[PDB]
Amino acid sequence: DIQMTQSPSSLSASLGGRVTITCKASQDINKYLAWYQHKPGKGPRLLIHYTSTLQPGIPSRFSGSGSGRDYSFSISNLEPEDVATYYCLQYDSLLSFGAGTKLELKRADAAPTVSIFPPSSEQLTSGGASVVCFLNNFYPKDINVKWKIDGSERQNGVLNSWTDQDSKDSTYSMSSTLTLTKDEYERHNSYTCEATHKTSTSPIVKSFNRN
Amino acid sequence: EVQLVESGGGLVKPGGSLKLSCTASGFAFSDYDMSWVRQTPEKRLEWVAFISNGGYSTYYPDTVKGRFTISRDNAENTLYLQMSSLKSEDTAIYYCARQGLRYFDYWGLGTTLTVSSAKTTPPSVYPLAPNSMVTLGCLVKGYFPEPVTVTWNSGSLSSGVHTFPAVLQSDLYTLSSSVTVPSSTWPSETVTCNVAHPASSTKVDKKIVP
């Protein structure tokens, strides 16, 4: 087909600023390029067709440009509604989409609030134990978790998942769940998740004993 | 007032069949070529099927050609997508899209398809209990399929509510939800995660106890 290369794949901007996205075609596409904004839970929304022609209704702070194989899309005066994923589409030869640019907010660095949780009385009856750790409301997105139990840092039986940018404080959050069987939990005693974030040289340590 | 409403999504075993529908209103539907486009879990947009305004012409990429059939009933303002020989790579949100010109100019909200051999399992729901502020949570473990819903205090707690994406493990999902409430409110008052799992017809309320 025609391959659209879209860059960058993710992007952080400050309210009121400017952002520029690029799409390179594998061949000349004769200005037949459209741009779409896609928000979670909604359907895509056409912004620009024919390189730079705005759809009726779309705020003028959106614009595009280009020719041959090199095109660019731009947001002036970034507004909170503009956080979304943006995609280009070439429609000169059949149809092909770019991979997308995730557009997130810039914000002041913030440290994680770390909270730790032993397995509940409800789960151990079942025969399992899950220790959970929240690394909530921090910035930037990128973070690291290390589990310690009786001084031993251990890895297996953990899997972790990440929030998208929170819409209230424009922070990110992170879930750390270490899971063991009913009896490897009662074996040991001191359980620790350490949260290390570029806000802080020290890791944020929170822990509990047999209580 | 152009509207496109997809419907019919659901869970299907590999090799199964499913017919998606799309209801058009707010425009002369029989003048418009129409497409189905899907979004994969990796958030790529994938053109899936095309049909011309009068139903004469049709197009399918090779990834679905021979397994999918797009069709329209213009007198009922409805676009259709009949899928068969379903494969896990078909798992996506499917969108209805209008093409006055070749670029899409209107989309629906989507309908979600899941292709999996995993069987439907209700979740286990565990309370997570540990300043002016306290953070609590609820752990929902070993369920299938997505989605689950988490509310706090029947929906009347909204901020400091962070619901985290499920990860697939084995064949089962585990998810967590965080609630941060003023430490005056708790444990003086009860904070309860309300979990809903439509696929297993589950609604469970777990009280967080100190």
């Binding site: 000169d92 030869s93 059949l94 | 070529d33 011309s52 305004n53 009068g54 004469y56 012409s57």
Partner: peptide
């Protein structure tokens, strides 16, 4: 699409050009 538009009547060469890949 093209079958509904350029098959009961002749479309110009400008028109047909717009359907090309």
């Amino acid at each position: 699409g093209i079958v509904e538009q350029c098959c009961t009547s002749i479309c110009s060469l400008y028109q047909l050009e717009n359907y090309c890949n």
